[PDB]
Write a protein that binds this ligand. Structure first.
Ligand SMILES: Nc1ncnc2c1ncn2[C@@H]1O[C@H](COP(=O)(O)OP(=O)(O)O)[C@@H](O)[C@H]1O
Ligand SMILES: Nc1ncnc2c1ncn2[C@@H]1O[C@H](COP(=O)(O)OP(=O)(O)O)[C@@H](O)[C@H]1O
Ligand SMILES: Nc1ncnc2c1ncn2[C@@H]1O[C@H](COP(=O)(O)OP(=O)(O)O)[C@@H](O)[C@H]1O
Ligand SMILES: [Mg+2]
Ligand SMILES: [Mg+2]
Ligand SMILES: [Mg+2]
Lengths: 370, 7, 121, 370, 370, 7
């Protein structure tokens, strides 16, 4: 009876049963294949590896992400992620109970339809349902009104909601995300003499980005501080020894959000898109959105990002408007907890996309119901 | 937007 | 001003009526051993509203309700299932939503119970 | 035994029990419906909202007034206002005791009859009675002779009375009212660069009109004063911050009464209609009407309107005639207090329209009795 | 002696000498600046580019429109458009002969005054005159009576005229325009998998909108036809190859006019505003306005828009009223030809705003004369 | 407007 959930993130897969506070299994969204010949006999060494198994053997594997900017490029590869998600990671049959999926807004219709075409034919779930990755965050926060900021590894949206009413006119999409931070972080390290120029070497630079980078509340003041003081310099032990030390690169890449002029994207910035999206709404709605600015998903773990975003929107926003940015510790999963909650609703049982309705209407049934 | 206040 | 003492807030009739709604609904709930100290905040979980309908209507809900909601959305699911049941009961309700009942807009919750008094009599 | 009252104003609903000095409940005459899709599950979010609840959620609701110029356009919508008036606002049954209603003069017969057709069938009051909104003002003022000026949000009438005798030949009706002031106020602000072009944005402009506008005793002198001196400029804090500042617009719109040439209506003006209506009466009656010029209803709260109207009629009226305009503080409700008084009369118990008489004569019983 | 004309459109600049059938120079109303560093030496590469020169180098330029919704945001930028308009595009001195300007109705007074403050000080024309963009269309059509629909890239007004008498009470303004169509067209293409998310990429989507979109006389019938039949699908060759193909998106965006519910604006629609504006007029005037419904300006080039508008108003309008919508081929310039005509009148020589009168009365002289 | 005909 319980329906499982699969986030299908643009950089990380997060799946678990509904009504559960923590997910059962999480693994990176990667598929690798050998770039070297197999000398051994009776070694196994098959073609495809996914999840944390790929990181174990990444040295001799070239990693390609099947999901990119919330858009699926390799469909045969993404099919392997789901087979590994259910059978290998969770060890649960999909045919017994339905599944809940998530996807970023304004994606192409083919991704939204083809996603459904695979489930019922390959795995044959009893039913299915897709949901915008943003809306689930409210369920986790337990508030009807707010503006959500996903910041996943592929895309960020900045959609406002007012008492549960989504406004498609105010919704936004910006492709800047963690892979751009990693690709930019791989670039600026060239300055310090460190070179990471492969798929396997990318993952270490991503690992450096997680535990060591901060948002730099005051960029211009901190850059002058970095050159004068070496206190910010810290080291990370990449494999193969070769300790390293990053200084102003520690906080150069996360600034790409607030100003993407470094990477070259013609975008206003994360702070101004939230300012733009709120201004697209009616005048009466703006007060509650400033008071309820939900922060969710990955890329929001940089310490002080709530302080930078509160300091920044306050300058653009008018006085007398109280700005409170909700950055709970449980983010990086809040989209998932919304799925456990959204599947738990008894009302939600009507909104599934059953097998019998698919054969009648075809894969175009998603748009009218979802 | 482009008005002295609303829009 | 003296011209509108009632319209501001906390008029005597508003409090006297509220105390009347509190006593009436509690008497039906004595069988389930449930009491409503403050009608504004006690109906936030919505379970008391479901139990009140079970006693009066003597019927079972058309959708299953959550046993205890921790998050906000599950509370609205319990209340929304309640209001949808009154539609099946052929009762007309205007401008009483699940959000107001949880947020305790005292002007509106008293209207919800008054519709039940005249229907169930 | 006590009979309730319902003003049924063209812009505001005011209802309460008879024999009461202040009304029990007041709420705007508005019905709204969502103009956005409902993304949340188990949210409620039903179709219709009325009263102050609509102003709370006006950002995502399009507001339509069911009553317009004292004429009902949406009958199914106006039925919801009465259901909210009795059950939700007052929490009182209509079947127990009869109700008193009000309506502006010279309305179409369908509004006067259909108003009755709804009560006995939908709510099933024991009896009912309709009364012209003007006559009730005398009961509040406690004087038999006078000329009344309702100035409600829909319409103004200017009817004279002489010892309780209403004269239908002297009665007048002018559709200029507060909505025209608001719609005109929404227009002239375009000049200052502020744009309010929606139903929700209309309510803020109405709120600006209430607490900030004045009648400008001397228009031509004050306009030259506004350009020279910035003392009249004041600010209002609309939601969404965005403070604003109005100057000559502060008093441009209420002048539409005395000269509707701005909005383009081919009307003589409020000052001259009272002058016209009094001249339609007999010569002996004119003395008392000048001495007793009652000012009632909404739109009469602009400070100094009694001074402007006294100054203006004095120029048109001949000398030796003492002009005293009665603008009590308790106006904006004087039509209601007349209802509490009119229902309190023991003589008035005969004038009700009972249920048993309706079935015998049908809905055409209103005209002969009322 | 001849006075030049400058339309100053919200999305396109159109200027030429009076008494001329076709304009001398037309260029987009855009100013761009580099978003990349200049590596070359002695390259020029100055800060600002405007007109078609900006479209040539748009790849490395971020485009910002100085004029927006008929309202000027960047004054220093708009000054550059006029300097390019006279010296670079037309190669004519402004000091020799006066200039005629146009602007949309109900704009803020600052735009109407500051527009004048720049000319006499910066360019020092001998005289100047401003005119509402709607009235000029009658001069082009050569008819005294009619209702005009500008539909410029910024704003649409729907003003009626009766024998040359403009009615300010019936005038209307709606900010929905081509930029909203482009911004909405950029949105719905996300559905087909095409992404245009920059200022330079916006111009291609605008170019797609011009030559390929139609109004879809029957929306609901054509949508079902689009899914069943692929005949409507056509392709456009954007730069960088990457051919594309749009189906139901070909006619989804122009429908935003007749129903703005897609973009979310709380507006009645283009068909109903013309219906509303005409009903605001006197009863006798309505007959001629239905017979003379002028269609002008940009955004009216969608094939069949006269058929959709005639079919739509006919349903709302009563029978026996002949509806003839005048959509001449020479529109997209009819506001300009009115300027060439309006400047050609000998009577019009008195209505100029000369230099000597400006210094006496200041920039507030516009409102009383214009 | 809001009348059975003119307005
Ligand atoms: N502690 C951390 N600090 C900074 N960034 C982090 C941290 N943890 C994860 N991330 C970033 O978040 C990204 C994953 O985002 P995720 O929450 O999976 O979004 P989605 O679920 O939409 O894929 C990774 O690419 C990683 O760079
Ligand atoms: N303090 C005030 N100053 C100016 N106008 C006011 C004020 N208060 C209310 N109004 C106007 O009065 C109108 C309401 O009139 P109302 O008394 O309800 O007449 P009716 O009872 O016939 O509807 C509103 O539309 C509002 O614009
Ligand atoms: N052939 C066409 N089909 C559809 N739209 C067009 C066509 N040509 C121009 N447009 C639109 O008209 C707009 C320009 O309007 P314009 O005539 O310049 O008004 P204004 O003069 O008030 O600026 C452009 O933004 C463009 O999208
Ligand atoms: Mg995410
Ligand atoms: Mg009134
Ligand atoms: Mg134009």
């Amino acid at each position: 009876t319980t329906a499982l959930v699969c986030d299908n993130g643009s950089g990380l897969v997060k799946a678990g049963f509904a009504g559960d506070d923590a997910p059962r299994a999480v693994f990176p969204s990667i598929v690798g294949r050998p770039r070297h010949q197999g000398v051994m006999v009776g070694m196994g060494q098959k073609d495809s590896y996914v999840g944390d198994e790929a990181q174990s053997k990444r040295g001799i594997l070239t990693l390609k992400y099947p999901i990119e900017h919330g858009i699926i490029t390799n469909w045969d590869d993404m099919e392997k992620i789901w087979h590994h998600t259910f059978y290998n990671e969770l060890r649960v049959a999909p045919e017994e109970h339905p599944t809940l999926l998530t996807e970023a807004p304004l994606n192409p219709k083919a991704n939204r339809e083809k996603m459904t075409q695979i489930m019922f034919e390959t795995f044959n779930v009893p039913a299915m349902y897709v949901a915008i990755q943003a809306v689930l965050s409210l369920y986790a926060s337990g508030r009807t009104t707010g503006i959500v900021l996903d910041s996943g590894d592929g895309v960020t949206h900045n959609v406002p909601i007012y008492e549960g009413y989504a406004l498609p006119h105010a919704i936004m999409r910006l492709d800047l995300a963690g892979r751009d931070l990693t690709d930019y972080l791989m670039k600026i390290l060239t300055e310090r003499g460190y070179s990471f120029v492969t798929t396997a070497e990318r993952e270490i630079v991503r690992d450096i980005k997680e535990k060591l980078c901060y948002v730099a509340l005051d960029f211009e003041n901190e850059m002058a501080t970095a050159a004068s003081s070496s206190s910010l310099e810290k080291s990370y032990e990449l494999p193969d020894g070769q300790v390293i030390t990053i200084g102003n690169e520690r906080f150069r890449c996360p600034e790409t959000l607030f100003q993407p002029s470094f990477i070259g994207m013609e975008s206003a910035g994360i702070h101004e898109t939230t300012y733009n999206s709120i201004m697209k709404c009616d005048i009466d709605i703006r007060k509650d959105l400033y008071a309820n600015n939900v922060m969710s998903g990955g890329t929001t773990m940089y310490p002080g990002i709530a302080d930078r975003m509160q300091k920044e929107i306050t300058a653009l926003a008018p006085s007398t408007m109280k700005i409170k940015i909700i950055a709970p510790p449980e983010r990086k999963y809040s989209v998932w907890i919304g799925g456990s909650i959204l599947a738990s609703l008894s009302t939600f049982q009507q909104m599934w996309i059953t097998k019998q309705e698919y054969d009648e209407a075809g894969p175009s049934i998603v748009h009218r119901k979802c | 937007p482009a008005w002295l206040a609303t829009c | 001003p003296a011209t509108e003492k009632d319209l501001a807030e906390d008029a005597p009739w508003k409090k006297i009526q509220q105390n009347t709604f509190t006593r009436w609904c509690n008497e039906h709930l004595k069988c389930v051993s449930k009491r409503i100290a403050n009608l504004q905040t006690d109906l936030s979980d919505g379970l008391r509203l479901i139990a009140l309908l079970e006693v009066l209507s003597q019927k079972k809900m058309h959708r299953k309700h959550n046993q205890r909601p921790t998050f906000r959305q599950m509370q609205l699911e319990n209340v929304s299932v309640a209001l949808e049941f009154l539609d099946r009961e052929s009762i007309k309700l205007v401008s009483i939503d699940s959000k107001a009942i949880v947020d305790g807009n005292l002007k509106l919750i008293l209207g919800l119970i008054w519709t039940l008094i005249l229907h169930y009599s």
